[PDB]
Amino acid sequence: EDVVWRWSCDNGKCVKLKNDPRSSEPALSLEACKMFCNEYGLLWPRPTGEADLGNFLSKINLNSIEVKILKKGATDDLMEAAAKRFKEQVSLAIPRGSTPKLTGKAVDVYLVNENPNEKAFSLEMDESYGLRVSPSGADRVNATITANSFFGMRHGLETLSQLFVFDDIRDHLLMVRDVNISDKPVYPYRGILLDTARNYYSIESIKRTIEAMAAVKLNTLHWHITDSQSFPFVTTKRPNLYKFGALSPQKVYTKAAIREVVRFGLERGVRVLPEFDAPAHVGEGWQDTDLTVCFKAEPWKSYCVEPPCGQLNPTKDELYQYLEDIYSDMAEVFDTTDIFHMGGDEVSEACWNSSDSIQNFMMQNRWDLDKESFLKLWNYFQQKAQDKAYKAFGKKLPLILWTSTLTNYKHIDDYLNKDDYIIQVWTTGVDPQIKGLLEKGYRLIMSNYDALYFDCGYGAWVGAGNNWCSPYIGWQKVYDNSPAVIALEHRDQVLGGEAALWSEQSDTSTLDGRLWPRAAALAERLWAEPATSWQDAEYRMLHIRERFVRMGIQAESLQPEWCYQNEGYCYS
Template structure:
C-alpha cells in the first residue's frame, strides 16, 4: 500500500521544517556575529587566541629574515613574527626613509597597550594646535591600520611628548626645518616614555611618522609591540621632495588625490605639484573666470571646486605636504578658453605639426587682454594655495602654431621681427615677462617661479630669457642631457624630474600609434632608487633643490594612479631624504616592508614580487647568496 499524507499534514510538516531551518540559520548568524565582535580591536578586554597554533617563525640570518618551522624545543622568546624579525634584522630598525643622523634602537620589543597610547604637546592655545591634533589622529589611525587581527589584552601604556620650538609656523616652505629627534626611554613598570623634539610642526610630524614605523603588530602573539629604547636624530638632505600629478588628461578624484598625499606623508615627501589644467580639460573652479571650468571640464561632476581645493590643501598640510599649483602656459592650454579670443590652434590638424600630442592649443601672446585674464587666474590660485613658489609651466611651445596664425605674424612684422626661431623666442619672452609681472602683482612680492626645461632653457636663450634670480628650472629631459650641466654651470637651482628615471607613466602601450609609449620601457623601483642627485649634479649638488616623480595621465586615472606611483615614488623618497649612497640591494627588504605598510594604509601600491619571496628574504634575487 502506497504511503500517503494529507495536504493538511503536509503543510504542517513543511512549516516545521522551515521554522527549524530559520532557527538554525539565526543561531548560526548570531554565533558568527559574536565571533566577529570578539576579534574587533575596539574590545580591549577580550583575549583573542590565534585560530591555530603558529607553525612558522622568522629568524635573522646574515642580515635577512628566514622562514623556519616552530619546534617544541623553541624558547617562546625566540619565536619572532616577520615584523619583529625585520625590526631586529634590518638596518635602522626597518625605518623608511632611513634616518640621516644617529640611530640607536633597543635590543628587545615590549608589549604595548594599543588603547593607552597618548600624545601630549606644548602647543595648546597656539596657532598650530589644530594641526598638531589632526596629526595625532593620523598617527593613531596609521598604527590601527597595521593591526590585521585581534589584540590580546594587556601591555604597557605609551606617553608621547611633542616639543615644538616654533609654535607659529603653519606653512611649509623651502626654508622650513623638517628635522626632529626621537627618544624612547627604557620603561618603568607602567608606561613607555617617548620624547619627540622639533623646531616646527613639520619636523614633529616627521618624528611621529618614524614612531609609527617603530610600533609593530606581532601577528603570532596578536599584540602591538615597540622597542624598549631608541635614540634617533634625523633631517632631510633635500628641501624639495615631491610628486607632480596631471589631473587634466584624465580627471583624478579627490579621494584618489588624498590617497596620493597620504602615501607622500607616510614616505616623508613634502611637495604635491598639482598640474591642474592642460589642453585636454580645465577642471579647476576659478572664482574670477568661472566660464573656464564650465566650458572646459569633461563633466560638471569633474571639477575641483573651491571647497575641494581648500580641503585638499588642509589635508596635505596635516601630513607635512604643501600643494604647489601649476598653470602651464603659453602652450598646454585649450579647453575652456574657446570663447576668450586668446586661444589659437585648438585641435589643429594634423596635430603633429602644431603640438606634441592632441589636442593642440596655445595662447596668442599679442592679445593684451590675455594678461588681465592670467592675472585673475594667478590671484585665485595664490589666494587658495598660499604657495611659497609658483609653477608657470612653460614647456613644449610649438612655433609652427604661431607661424600659421596670420594675425600673430602681422603683429611681429609690425615690430620689425621676422619669423625665425629667434623671433618666436622674442614673442615667447614677451609672454613670459608679462606673465611674470602679473604674478608678482598678485603675490605682492617677487615669488620664485618654476619653469620646465624647454627651448628657452637652451644655452642660446637661457640667461636672457629666464634670469637665475627669478626662476628655478625643473628638468624633464634625461639625466645625461647637457642642459643639466649648462644650467648648473650658469648658477641655476634645479628640480630633477628626469624622464629616464622619474616618469611613472613610461612603459605602456602607445595611445596615438602602435607599439609602446614614447618613454618606454617601464622604470623599475631599482632605477628610481639609483637616481641620486649627487650622481647627476656632482660637486654642484647644492644647487639641486630636490626632485619630483611625475605621472602624466594620458593612460592613467583614479583607478590606476596608486599603482603607477606607489611604491616606486617611495624609492625616490628615501634618496631625497637621506641622499642614499648605497645601492638598491641594501634597501630592498625595508622597501618591500614599506610597500606593505602603504597597502595597510589603504594605498593600492603595486606588488613588487611574490609574497613567498617577501617571507623568504634573499631566496629569489638573481645572484643572491642562496642561489647556486
C-alpha cells in the same frame, strides 16, 4: 587558524623555520625578526643621523597611548590633529582581521615643538627632529619627539609609528624599547607631479595620495591642474573657462574642494603647489575667447607633440587680464604655497606662425618669422605673465619652468634670472644642459624621464605599440637615480626631485598603482641620499609596500610575498 612558522636572523636575513613546540627559545614573528635583523629595521625612509634601535621590543596596550603637546602656539590646531592621527597610524602595524590583546605597557608620546608659531612652507623650513624612546618606570614608555618646527615634529610622529610591530603568533602589539634617532632631509623639495587635466582624479584619490606621501615624508604635491585636454580648475573670475573646459560638470575642482585638499596637505607637511602651464598646453575652455590659436589643428603632428594642439596668443592684451584672474583665483585657494609653477612646456613655432594676427604683430614690430623671433615672442609672453603672477600672489615668489628652448643655458639669462626662476629638468642626467644650467647658478628640480616618469611603459594611446618613454621604470631604477651624482659640486643648487605622473593613461582608478611604492624609492633617495644602492633597501621596500596596502593604498606588487617571508632566496 594560527601562524605555524617562526623567523630567525642569520647573516642579515630572516630565515623561515618551523615553530617546533619542543623548544625553550621564544619564537620570533616575521616583522619582529625584521626590525632587528635589518640594518635600519622597518624604517622608510632610513634616518640620516643616529639610527640606534637597540635590541628589544615591548608589549603595548593599544588603548593606553596618550599624546602630550608640551609647547603651545599658533600651530595648536595642526599638532592636535597630527596627534589624533597618530593612534590611527599605530594601528597600521596590525593586519586587518587580526585584533591585538589589550595588555602591555602604556605609551606617553611627548611632543616638543620649539617654534610652535611657524606654519609656512619655504625651501628653508626646518624639517629635522629628534626621537627618543625609553621605558618609563614599570608600566610605561617615554616617547619624546623634539623638533624646530611642526613639520619636523610630524615627520617624527611618522617615524615613531614605524617602530610598532604586530606579533601575529601571539597577537601582541609591540614597540621598540630603546631608540635614539636624529633625522633631517638632504633635499628640501620632495614631490609628486600629478597631472589632473589629461584625465580627472577624484578629490578623495588626491587626499589618499597626500596621505601616502606623508607616510614616507614627501612634502610637495605639484598639481598640474590645466592642460589642452581640460580645464577643471574652478575659476570664479573667468567661469567660462571651466564651464567649457571641464570633461563634465562633476569633473571639476571647486574652491571648497581645493581648500580641503590644501588644508589636508598642510596637516601632513605637504605643500600643494599649483601649476598653470602656458603659453602651450592650453585648449579646452578658451573656445570663443579668440585668445588661442591652433586648437584642434590638423594634422596635429605638424603643430604639437600631442593632440589636441593649442597655444595662447601673446599678442592680445586681454589674455593677460584672463591670466591675472586665473592666477588670482589660484592664489586665493592655494594659500600655503611659497612657489608657483608656470609650466614653460615646449612651444610650437609652427603653431604661432600659422596665425595672421601674430605674424602682423612680429612684422609691425620688426621681428622676423624665424626660430629666434618666436623665441622673442615667448620671452615677451613670459615677462608679462610673470608680472601678473606677482600681482596675483601679492608678492614676488619663486617661479618654476621646465627645461625647454626658452631655458637653454646658452641664453636663459636674456630675460630669466636664477633668483626668480627654478628649473624643472625632464632631460636625462647625462645631458649637457644640466651642467650648463648648474654653472650659471640655476636651481634644479630633477624629474628625468628615464628614472622619474611614472607614466612610461604602457600601451600606445595614439596608434599601436607602447608609449613614447617605454620601458616601464621599476622602483630599482628610481632608487638609484641620484641628483648628487648628477649635480656633483653644485648639489646645493639641487632643490630635490619630483616623480611625474602624466595622465594620458592614468586617472582615479590607476593612481595608486602608478605612484606606489615607486614614489617611496624617490622618498628615500631625496630624504637620505644613500651611498648604498637599491639592493640594500630591497627588504625594507617590500615592507613599505605592505604598509601602503594596509593604509588602503592599492600599491603595485613588486615580488611574490614568498620572497618577503624568505629573504635571500629571491636574487639575480
